[PDB]
Amino acid sequence: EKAIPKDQRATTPYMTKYERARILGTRALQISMNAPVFVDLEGETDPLRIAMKELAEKKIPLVIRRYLPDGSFEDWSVEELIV
Amino acid sequence: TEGRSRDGGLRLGEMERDCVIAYGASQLLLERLMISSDAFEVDVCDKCGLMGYSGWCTTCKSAENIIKMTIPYAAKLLFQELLSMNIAPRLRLEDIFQQ
Amino acid sequence: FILSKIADLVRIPPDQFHRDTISAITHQLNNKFANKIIPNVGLCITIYDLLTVEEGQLKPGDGSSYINVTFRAVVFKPFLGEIVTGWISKCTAEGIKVSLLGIFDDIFIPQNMLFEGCYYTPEESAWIWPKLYFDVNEKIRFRIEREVFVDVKPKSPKEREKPPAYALLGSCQTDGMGLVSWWE
Amino acid sequence: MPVCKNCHGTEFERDLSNANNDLVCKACGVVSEDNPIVSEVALESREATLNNARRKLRAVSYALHIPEYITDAAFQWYKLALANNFVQGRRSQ
Amino acid sequence: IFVYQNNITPSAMKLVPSIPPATIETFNEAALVVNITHHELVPKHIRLSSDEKRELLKRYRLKESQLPRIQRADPVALYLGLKRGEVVKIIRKSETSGRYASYRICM
Amino acid sequence: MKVLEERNAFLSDYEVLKFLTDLEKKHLWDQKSLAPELQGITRNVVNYLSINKNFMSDESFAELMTKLNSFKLFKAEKLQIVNQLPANMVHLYSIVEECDARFDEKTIEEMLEIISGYA
Amino acid sequence: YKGEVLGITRFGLSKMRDSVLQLASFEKTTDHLFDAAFYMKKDAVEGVSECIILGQTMSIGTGSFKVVKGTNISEKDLVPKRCLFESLSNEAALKAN
Amino acid sequence: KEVVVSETPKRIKGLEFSALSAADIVAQSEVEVSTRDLFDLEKDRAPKANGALDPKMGVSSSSLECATCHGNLASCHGHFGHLKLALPVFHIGYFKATIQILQGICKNCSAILLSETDKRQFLHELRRPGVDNLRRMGILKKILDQCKKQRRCLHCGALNGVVKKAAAGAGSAALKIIHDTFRWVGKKSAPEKDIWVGEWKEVLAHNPELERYVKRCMDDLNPLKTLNLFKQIKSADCELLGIDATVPSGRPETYIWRYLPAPPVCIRPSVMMQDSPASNEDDLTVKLTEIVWTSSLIKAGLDKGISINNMMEHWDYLQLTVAMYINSDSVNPAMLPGSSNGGGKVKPIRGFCQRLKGKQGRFRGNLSGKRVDFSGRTVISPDPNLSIDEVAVPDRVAKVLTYPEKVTRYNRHKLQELIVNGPNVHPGANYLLKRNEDARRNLRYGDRMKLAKNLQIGDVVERHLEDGDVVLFNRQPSLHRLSILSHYAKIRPWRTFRLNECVCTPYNADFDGDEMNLHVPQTEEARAEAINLMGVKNNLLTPKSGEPIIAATQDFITGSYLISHKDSFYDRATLTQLLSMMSDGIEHFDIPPPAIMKPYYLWTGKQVFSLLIKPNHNSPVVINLDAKNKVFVPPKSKSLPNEMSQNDGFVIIRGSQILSGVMDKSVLGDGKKHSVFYTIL
Amino acid sequence: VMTISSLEQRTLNPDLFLYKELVKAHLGERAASVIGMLVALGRLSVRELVEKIDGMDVDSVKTTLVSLTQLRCVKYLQETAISGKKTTYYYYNEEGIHILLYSGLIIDEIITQMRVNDEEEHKQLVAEIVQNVISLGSLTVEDYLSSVTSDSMKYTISSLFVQLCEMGYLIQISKLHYTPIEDLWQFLYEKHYKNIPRNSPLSDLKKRSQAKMNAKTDFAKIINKPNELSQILTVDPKTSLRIVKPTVSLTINLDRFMKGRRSKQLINLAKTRVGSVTAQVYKIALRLTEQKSPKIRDPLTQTGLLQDLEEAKSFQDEAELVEEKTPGLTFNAIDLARHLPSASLINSHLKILASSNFPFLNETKPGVYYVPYSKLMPVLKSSVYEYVIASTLGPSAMRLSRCIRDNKLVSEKIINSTALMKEKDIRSTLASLIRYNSVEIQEVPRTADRSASRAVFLFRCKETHSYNFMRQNLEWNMANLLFKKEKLKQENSTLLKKANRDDLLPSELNQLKMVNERELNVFARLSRLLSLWEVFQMA
Ligand SMILES: [Zn+2]
Ligand SMILES: [Zn+2]
Ligand SMILES: [Zn+2]
Ligand SMILES: [Zn+2]
């Protein structure tokens, strides 16, 4: 009942529909707190939209963690994952 | 408060509230039925869970084991309602991080 | 003095994410401890080492970063009886309350093993032995014996200092003690 | 009554424009309280005699078509009139 | 295993379950006329070996309990004579998708 | 938060002062950069630690063990010798159990010549 | 789901669900609370109509997975350091014992 | 100094229910209400010395401090109060449970009356690790009547019988309980009954009045005697009945009232003082403040005077009262009320169980149904020109409906400017909150300007609203998953909520006079939750049928039809202007070859509508499809393809050009799988 | 609030609240907390304990549990299911804390055997003996006498030799000695239903009473096996005198202490209604018969079997004759001048037996001077309550309660006549009596569906209750008191370690006298209670 090792993973490699949500929201919120922005920021502004702008580039540095029912945990890197 | 005249605010009914569940939004509820309506800090006591003001648990005089956390004021009002009537929603607590 | 291992959950705000992680962990830890005293052990000095930091788990409500770690930070924990430098600070009739410049005032050595023959006079010696009086702001070798951990944060709302949370005690059972030039 | 926690001015104004109803100082513009909480919606010889005297009193009142108002002023005189026990042994009328 | 004719006395169930190591199975005569497992709606059930459970539970990482429950003293139960802690693999053929299967534990 | 090993590693001050001074050099280096609140204790810490050395070395710590490993000092005075009292006469006798007792002449004396090797 | 066919009414809605607040969010709200606390029901909070009460997050949808940021560090900097305070002072206690 | 401060974020895991003990109450509240009521009329209007109201219990108006934790209505959550009560009044809440706990114990020696290891069997059955709540209750349903059918108790030697809950429903008897000597059958010897008749021989023969006329009452249990009885088995079984005793609660004795918990003032706020002395009471403030009275009656009573007859009916009135305090139930058991009565027959005396309970009460209509903040309500009106997934919002509710923003590093040269506008003009802000967490600064006094010249990083401003702010939008009684949607808001003049007609169908929006609800979110991550997940574009379909629920309706169909009408034609000027109007500007159109050539030039409607789909050559939309609009007319059956028909036909599209047939609902028409605005998606 | 009447510790804890202090106060920490769980939740198993206590499994439970067993504070029953394995389970040893709770009184057991050497080293000797025998557990004269010095006269140094028997002192305790009496009845319930020569399903009566009689008659020798067994008492080795078996471990008998202390309370009751001469006579009259009678011993199976509204009579009438005939042979018939200081001719002075009349003794076999018991002892105990509600509520209370004694269910209208006093008193001294229960209430609906005022009220006694919650006396100061002993200790706790190794300061000597008089109150206060306790809990 620990983190499943890197190679073997059982889950869809696609995003969920909800993943795209909380990734933006959380990321956008971290942008509104003064965090460095990795994508080149074009002349636009406001926290949420530059996050979308960033997820076009897969430059988000987060790891999404999936708990199966038993609590067998799980990991995926946002870069590693396909829209 | 209610309607026009007095002052603003609108209704989210259980008939409606369910809607956002289907979409699956957690954060929209916690913004909605929590942050934006009654945002409230209750000080509770881990040991023998009950509420309390500032530092004291007051059922067990401690000023030690209290933990500050937030909760809908309707929910507290539901406790002080209950606990008035004889019944005791004791709150067992655990930390979020690290299991 | 010594070095010890503690584990704690630490919060880095989004600001420092440019700065390297381990430095931010260090900075926040010093912000949390520094002078502050961890109870029933005795006060820290600063973070010394660091180790086994792992993937940090954030919370839905906020979105700052939360990483729980463990390490060894330098604390002040001497052994029991110890002859050590210091001087009387604020005292009237009892065993002298010594301090040490730039640490704390909480070392209090009462008079029990302190030499019996003495006389007290409103001057600067508390008690004068047959060998004599000493003076505040002086190199003074005094032994340590026991320590009192007290917490005492029982604020009863309508009471709106007594901070001996960590205090040490000893006495002078041998010569050269209370004035260093008696020995040497 | 209270003082600004910053400007230390005593002049407070409750802005009714935008349906906040905040209380603020005209000095530094800090608010005192937001969220303007508002409300909405035995055995005695003296209770018997008194309320009985609002009965008998109000009786003779609208008989004369006097203001019902004045009755309350008179009644309380009767109250003070009982305080000296002047009202005990005479004809109630 | 034997069958009733008409009456079931509560004296029969008073002590029905005498034998600890062995047991009874009791039916009404009328209760068996058409064979229920063979009927139409009731799909084919498979009693899976007691070891095969462990396999199953390790597939989905399911503990016990927390499975679809079949009540005991059920006509399909009785026909297949399930006991405590036994698991049946049901093949339900329903034309929306096709033939698929799901599991149930006897309680 | 939760504490694991309280009594853990007994740390006397040899390079500890030097190392704290090193971390200090990393941020702003105490008083003079002219040519966080953490600064408050450091100048304090280095204070009480510096005065006895005046009123230091690196290898002398490794030099210190050699003949000192031969004594009965256990772990207590064996650290204490580094700092308090000039390893002389009754000073060293004032601490450890059975200090003079069995072992006397070379044991109380060699502390003087070895402490002269550093202090 | 359970063995016997049931559900959806105020009676059948007490079937599995142990949550006393949702069975108390529905009907008979009084005696669910009383008769509940009499038997001293434990009542874990896993639900949804449950969690919206206490205002904590939800176990479905967006609330299905904790999200984590990579802390991005290697053990190379994590090795401790001392020049042995202990080991040198050790050998004074290693004899006459 | 300064010991380290440590905390860890916690969330609720489970709610342990229990009754409070008899002790824990008085171990809680600050002050006994006790005393009397009176609410001290003298000096101040009801300064409330001690008594039911009390400054150190809580407060009501924002006037005076709270004593224990003061600071008025801001920080005082209320405190409790504990009403001392003479004699152990019975309890209506746990009542029917008390009929169990008492149902299942012999009435003499009060040992659990099921016996031996059988009782242990009931135990071993419970603790089996996989037992759920339902299993529990069922097992209790067994263990209970298993002891019913017992007759004589095990080691007491005495017998017992049914306990019937005397009468029903009135409140006269409803709180009185009875068990009796039963199953005697009269032919067998009952030595007990022999004692029983011999008892009355000293009454009837003495006092013949009572005689046998009113008789056969057997006995009852004085709710006093029933706790003297509950005090027996103080361990042993316990849970066999249903109560874990590791004694946090300490057994089945607190079930019946002893110290009655007075609720805070903030639960029972005195109504506004209003003009003139009497402020309206607020329920609980009158009931228990009477319970104090009847209590201190029975305390001064039973002390010296009264009588065993004139004792009880008071005490009965006590349990009937407090029952009416936590419930309604019993209504008028031929009683009428006492001090502070009226008596014009005021029905809804119930103050408590119901405010918690039903219809739109607390629990549902209030806590789960919370009325919300940052909203708006308005009549609607169509706006075709506005795109989908926007809601035109009237600027006059945009001034007063604000969104929070944390200005950081990217926002300044907007926001340090956005303040200087001030709250009056639209593209601006009103409230401002510094990082120093004071309270906040309304923009009221003045400054700004030299105020905006600071605006540190972590500071918070509140924008009015702009184009692009994500706003979720609700309509009516909401039939299904599509009511709540979310739109990029765009600000316009006049006043009304303008959506695009295409989205009327999810709302089943009729226009006419119906009203809406406009909800902005607040926290930065609820936004990205809204437009991204709950927004229009991705929710373009329906949850149940996987079928397009937003499309052209009414004008859009028919107008499209009239362009699609095979009869129609156009010309390069007219067409050019159409193919423009379709997109207000902004686009590069490549005109395809005209349908017919020679006797002028023309372009058939299937083209001017076809280019709608693939305006550019770079618009990466390539379709193809067949369909059937309605009123399809079967062709000459010799012709197999239905495309050729008496009129129109299949709509068959290839290479994103329309080929045959008119369109007319169906293909663009909201609710058939095969469809254009479906297939494109 | 104010903590002086101490509510937190003051109500929700009856019964057990005693023990959880005793084992705490008298043993402490982990050793205590188990028994609290045991008594509270009843039957329990080794592993299952730690599911709750949070007591660091198979460490304390092992240590603490067997530690209790050595002091026999727990009951111990193990068996295996039919499925397999094996398992134990535990109960709290009957009273057994009874032993601890009495203690120095069980030391006062010396006074019976105090004869021969009177207030000698012999006193201090046997004192040390018994006070050690309770402290350890079962003892052996071999291993204890081994711990005792050799090379002195062993039957003398340890002179309690034939005196090891008497009534009290010791019995070899093994196995079936301490097992739940109930469950040993259930075990003996085998061999009878379990063993039937597969005869017929007909007439469970032959299956029952036969089995029960066999159960009963086999049960008899089960308790009489410990009663006395000669292979202990009889042993007379060479160069020696008659001794117990020095090998087997023997333990303090509780019931002969029970018996003997009960005799004292009868000496008190009679010490009222007769004269000091006749009293003292009766005081030595039991001393011959104080051995045999069961007191608390015979009801026995009355715990552990369902009664029968028929057969329970066959139990009670069995108790009616039990001590009367055959044990009557052991009882007073002709006895002469046991000690005594009346003088000169002692015979007619012995004829004083007839002076005993009410409400005890005063029967015999027709004309031999004898006292019945098997009728008397049972028909006696029912009287003993008496006072215990005189200073309590005031004397004016008794007579009306006492009045409610003779007649029954009697309305206060004719109470006002039968007893005598104005209303103003009767209302209080009754109401003041009813809150403390006893009298209880009856009522009848009078022209009512169910109503208060229009009805009429009656009273009663129902003595089971009235006796029963007088066991509040148990939780009363046998708990609160003993705690007021405990919380006192922490004041001088820092002094206690000093006074331990002392055998300084004037104020230390002052609080010495303070805490000492304090103590001498708390325990003598206890004995005052316990003397009032012995009645209710048993007999
Ligand atoms: Zn607490
Ligand atoms: Zn101000
Ligand atoms: Zn307060
Ligand atoms: Zn009974």
Residue numbers in the entry:
A (entry chain F): 71 to 153
B (entry chain B): 1051 to 1149
C (entry chain G): 2 to 131, 137 to 166, 189 to 212
D (entry chain R): 1 to 41, 72 to 123
E (entry chain E): 109 to 215
F (entry chain D): 1 to 35, 53 to 72, 98 to 161
G (entry chain A): 1364 to 1460
H (entry chain A): 2 to 682
Quote the study on this structure:
The chimera protein Brf1N-TBPc-Brf1C28, which functions in Pol III-dependent transcription both in vitro and in vivo, was used in place of Brf1 and TBP. In order to stabilize the complex, we used a nucleic acid scaffold containing a 16-nucleotide (nt) mismatched transcription bubble in the presence of a 6-nt RNA molecule, mimicking an initial transcribing state. Local resolution estimation shows that the Pol III core region is very rigid with resolution mostly at 3.9 Å, whereas peripheral regions such as the stalk and TFIIIB are more mobile with a lower resolution (5–7 Å). The 6-nt RNA molecule seems to be absent from the active site of Pol III, likely being washed away during sample preparation, or being cleaved by C11 of Pol III. The positioning of Pol III active site by the mismatch bubble at around +7 relative to the TSS (transcription start site) justifies that the initiation complex is in the initial transcribing state. TFIIIB tightly encircles the promoter DNA in the Pol III ITC. The ZR domain contacts the dock of Pol III and connects to a linker region that inserts into the RNA exit channel and interacts with the single-stranded template DNA near the active site. The N-terminal cyclin fold domain of Brf1 contacts Pol III at the wall and protrusion, similar to the Pol II system but distinct from the unique Pol I system. The inner helix is the C-terminal helix of Brf1 homology block II (residues 632–649 in the chimera protein; residues 492–509 in full-length Brf1), while the outer helix belongs to Bdp1 at its C terminus (helixC; residues 495–532). Both helices contact and stabilize the second winged-helix (WH2) domain of C34, one subunit of the Pol III-specific heterotrimer C82/34/31.
